[PDB]
Design a protein that fits this description.
4 copies of one chain form a homotetramer. Chain A is mainly beta and about 400 residues long. Helix content of chain A is about 5%, strand content about 50%. Chain A has 4 domains: about 140 residues, Tick-borne Encephalitis virus Glycoprotein, domain 1, CATH 2.60.98.10; about 70 residues, Viral Envelope Glycoprotein, domain 2; about 80 residues, Viral Envelope Glycoprotein, domain 3, CATH 3.30.387.10; about 110 residues, Immunoglobulin-like (Sandwich), CATH 2.60.40. In chain A, the strands form 6 sheets. In chain A, strands 1, 3, 4, 5, 6, 7, 8, 9, 12, 13, 14, 15, 18 and 19 form a 14-stranded mixed beta sheet that branches. In chain A, a hairpin with a 6-residue loop joins strand 3 and strand 4. At the A-B interface, helix 2 and strand 21 of A face helix 2 and strand 21 of B. Chains A, B, C, D: It is found in: Host cell surface; Host cytoplasm, Host perinuclear region; Host endoplasmic reticulum membrane; Host nucleus.
């Protein structure tokens, strides 16, 4: 639900003195937001849920052809009529067959036939339309408070400490205030109506899969169709072959399923999960994250007085940061972790910066663990933890591409 | 099995003094052969049977993907190996997933994965090749002896009177003599090796249907294949999608059946029935029909002496002939029917001609029926039946297209 | 201008007692109309002329790319601007090139460029629309009066004898009365508005040829376009390739002509001649031909008394008629030609019928020629010309398909 | 001809103690080679020249159709023969036209015609094949001796100082020794036969452009063709339309040029310059560069004693290096430039490394300039130039991606 470890992570820095930041969150992106005097926040799109889908029409890709009958007349006795032309379920076709004395006619020549067969649809793809007002954006937010290697990405654990929440914004309720315990509150003013091209396509369901197809390409589809406004199948003939007629009988058969060809045409189309409501992969939700009522807690606790150790030594996170896990030996917590990223032990001016702002031991229990993410400078530096003569340190070297 | 009534009927006239005629018989054609002093014959291709088909290869159009497993390793610990790479039934694929502290790795970055799945073919199309020496042409022959409206097209009935037979010619036995009772014998010298382009294509079986496809188009088919010379499926990946991998697991699924797309590509291809042997629609069999030992029987019987009547009045057959059915009142048969097609009753010179040459009452039973086909001249003429003062007659007018 | 000899000739027979006949005349068809007590008429569509074509838009299929210039800036000095972006005749494109000390920049990296080139259209296809009210149908009519082998199909010659005319019908003037001398007058009430699908397509001109293209297919054309409502070429880039940029210069070239590809897409499209006005191949003009004021002249002249001869013996015209040319030896004309088509010389009842109704020698000059078309019965008949003991005759036999 | 500034530059490091290095040089790549105790070398592919191209065949894409004639005969008089069927330059076609009395025939029906027209090819595309033994690889080599900002990329200037050469390798002479003055000699053993897929395609020339097309796709081309083995155009009809024949005349015209459609099919095909010989864009030439007889000159000259200055301050080259230009005030040259890249002025241990190994003032003239490229460590360092109390220095900070 938060960012550390994700492939797609971006860092957004609030401008100087600004209590808010503009965000563009997408289906796959995880954003880490850092603003002056604010705890660091992760924000990520979880999903987009469109609920009230309405059918536009259906196409049969697999038809059933049964109950074939042919009525026949001799040459010169007029056109055959098959009484099944009265049943709207049946497809009928006028034809002719060679007749003569050998097959029951007094005259030789073309005898009339009329051949019918029941058409039913075995499998159909249903096209549905999305209404822009029935679109829920679900978003996860995480505050970089105290966490461990083990629990950092554990949602229920972070909810536990008032350090994460999930919430929904809709066109109708595009703004949400959510309290984060002692951190106070953040609001998100989003623009859910300018997030998705809702009506430039349909949701089409084909078997176990559903797609986002063009709504024009969908109309031009060459298959038998039904609408709410036309319950009877039209263009049924597309899925049927009237075979060669002979004497007084004629075969009629349905094509095999056309599903495979649909998945063919549906190559570059987005795939989406559909049950009662559709879940959209692609998100483009703009939001303003407001942090005027968010606070950095723990900024004035006394500094932890006892020794720390590295439970996990620093590793490059691949996001242009470095992360450690500390274990704190003391039982004087809650307390502020003295930690800085410096150029040398002889000069303690902070040159690196913390992503986990204001790292904090939050319990009086001994040996609790605290994960800290930071951005050391390029070249050599040291991570120095602890104060006075309890300090520990670790060298770091941050480099980039080798020669090439 | 014979021609009267068929849509596709041609008339072939033996040349003057010639005891044989060259014939080209095709899948659908019925030939009526008339030669000097010979009874009229119908000859038609019944079918072409290729027996000893040999597989060239098979293509899977519907695959089954099961037993998916993924083995995963952390970044810097090397490439994952999935032990299923040892099973030739499984398709495997190297991949990578984002790993870090959050999903069990001491280091952040791309962790190796190796994902396998069993591939089995649910439905395959089998391509077979025809051997030009294993091709039977089955042919029906009919002699225009005595027949009735009722029995004319009845094979067992004509076999009864020695007036029809069926027979086979092969490359190995391309000539057949067949006795036709008192009519004697006819031989057919055919050229079965110059009848079919046997090796310019394959017989391909797709579900319940079989087709004659190009043997080059068949090689270029993009599907997983097996040969007798390679029992293991190759190019299996064509019917599989390795889905997105995440952490330590990855989905793998088979495409749906591709059958429908095959019937698509198989539009202008010939359809053929295949069980143990294939039956070919298209025939082009050249034969010489030899009639030197065939005779017109009944040419010197006494003329029937009693009255005839028209059981069926003359009708245009649509083949440029006219057909009647006579009933013969006499019991002096077997006897020759006196019948001619003349310009007027005052001039009995034959101007029309008989297709049923030498019509004959073949029994002493009273009231037997005899069908007679003939070609009256254009304009007015008369069909005159009987001799002396027992004669009956019917006017005929033969016209063509109205003004236009 | 009339029918004898044409491939596409139909015969239309006025109904009994009817002074008018409904006609459907098409681009290629020639109609012979026969009505009771009326001279026989030929009617044929000559052409359809749409005049007031209006442009809908134009597409350039061959462009000229000239006067290329590139303006370049060093990395860190900002985006290059090419002053030709002010000229609407020029197409411009922002780019980048590798820069460094070696090519005049204090800094290494991507330097900005801006490259322009003049676009002019060398050859364009112009799409025009037809207005249904500006459509002239030109029609030729011919009356089967006296004609010779030589002059029968000679328009100026028939106009000479008041036996042919040409005339126009428009939506605005859909009815025309035209006098035919002593034959009186015929009127044609046509429906020019229900003759052509005028607005389901455009007239498109590509070089020396013009076509009737879909008006939707025409919009979707992927070429640079101009309208009367937009005089500047849009989508010019379609006919240009901006080549690879290097340092401070970049090549830009036009594609070659696209004309050939248009003729490719224009395969099944109708071809039409366009100059000031378009001439349409396809006609479907409905007319009522009214003959209440048309008369058969010559019906009561005295019968020609002298000998005729066959200047040309009877030949099958291939239209289900037979035509002769007579020479008339007498100088008693104008006079009625006694000619009939009979079953035998011993029975002069007319059984054949004249297409050239009331054949007539129209001059007192000796040895004038008169062409006569007729429809003899099937089988044998005679053409008997002259009266009393001056009569000549010719046998005719009319047959149809040989046996087959 | 050398690398500094190029977009595509790679750095190759000779292995420890190794006097040779394996290189893969490609059409666009520039390689900088650094080996122990050797001057740094740049090596780049300049081009690949295939000379002895042989035609395989030619296709006409633009035909000229002229001198049309039609010979015609009346129905029943037999087939027309056009005497131009004797000229191999003419394309002829049998046809039929409606004939009758109106256009000079005694009989009505289909009259025979035979229509011919001269075919000449206006423009043709010629397909040529490359012989793997006639392929020259041209290669530029540069030694990182003394150079200035101004002359570094100036070939004639570097040849001047024995610091660059160009040379050719062929299948027949795949190895080249080239002397570089006081630097000694380098040899390149290349594998020109394993560099290009010479015979998997043809060189096809279409107007002003030439392409590398498949040699199979080239055979299947549907255009009129000629080979050295068949000087007469075959399949000419592809570029001609025999228009509708009428009476005794028939139009015949050539299609327009097909060139545009070729450039269409030739989208993803490589473009190459062809005159007498072809120049190939794509190179893949493997070479072993041997440096056993190459030496670092100047390694034991006395250190320059006077002051340097920065003529150009250090800039990031975008290749993961930094380059400066020094001006040397002294006139004691030739002399060794003391220059090092250190962590701090208080610790002169070299931590950065020189790409311009052993930088050297090569003249006694005052104020000569010397360019130096180097790779400082990440973070802070200093470039220190000069010895004793004549030293100058410049701070450097090398960083990478900002937070994100």
């Amino acid at each position: 639900f938060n960012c550390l470890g994700m492939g797609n992570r971006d860092f957004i820095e609030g401008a100087s003195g600004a209590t808010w930041v503009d965000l563009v969150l997408e289906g796959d992106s995880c954003l880490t937001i850092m603003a002056n005097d604010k705890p660091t926040l992760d924000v990520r799109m979880i999903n987009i849920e469109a609920s009230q889908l309405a059918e536009v029409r259906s196409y049969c890709y697999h038809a059933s052809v049964t109950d074939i009958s042919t009525v026949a007349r001799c040459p010169t006795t007029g056109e055959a009529h098959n009484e099944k032309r009265a049943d709207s379920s049946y497809v009928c076709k006028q034809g002719f067959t060679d007749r003569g004395w050998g097959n029951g006619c007094g005259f030789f020549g073309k005898g009339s036939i009329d051949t019918c067969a029941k058409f039913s649809c075995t499998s159909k793809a249903i096209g549905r339309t999305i209404q822009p007002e029935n679109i829920k954006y679900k978003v996860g937010i995480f505050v970089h408070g105290t966490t461990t290697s083990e629990n950092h990405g554990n949602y229920s654990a972070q909810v536990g400490a008032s350090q994460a929440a999930k919430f929904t914004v809709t066109p109708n309720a595009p703004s949400v205030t959510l309290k984060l315990g002692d951190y106070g509150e953040v609001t998100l003013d989003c623009e859910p109506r300018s997030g998705l091209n809702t009506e430039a396509f349909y949701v089409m369901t084909v078997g176990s899969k559903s797609f986002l197809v063009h709504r024009e390409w969908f109309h031009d589809l060459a298959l038998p169709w039904t609408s709410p406004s036309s319950t009877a199948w039209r263009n049924r003939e597309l899925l049927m072959e009237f075979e060669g007629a002979h004497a007084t009988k004629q075969s009629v058969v349905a094509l095999g399923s056309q599903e495979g060809g649909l998945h063919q045409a549906l190559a570059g189309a987005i795939v989406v999960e559909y049950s009662s409501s559709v879940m959209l992969t692609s998100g483009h939700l703009k939001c303003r994250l407001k942090m005027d009522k968010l606070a950095l807690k723990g900024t004035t606790y006394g500094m932890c007085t006892e020794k720390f150790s590295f439970a996990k030594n620093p590793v490059d996170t691949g996001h242009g940061t470095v992360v450690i896990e500390l274990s704190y030996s003391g039982s004087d917590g809650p307390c502020k972790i003295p930690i800085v990223s410096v150029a040398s032990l002889n000069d303690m001016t902070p040159v690196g910066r913390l992503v986990t702002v204001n790292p904090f031991v939050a319990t009086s229990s001994a040996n609790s663990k605290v994960l800290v993410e930071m951005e050391p400078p390029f070249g050599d530096s040291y991570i120095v933890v602890g104060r006075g003569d309890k300090q520990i340190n670790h060298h770091w070297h941050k480099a980039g591409s080798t020669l090439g």
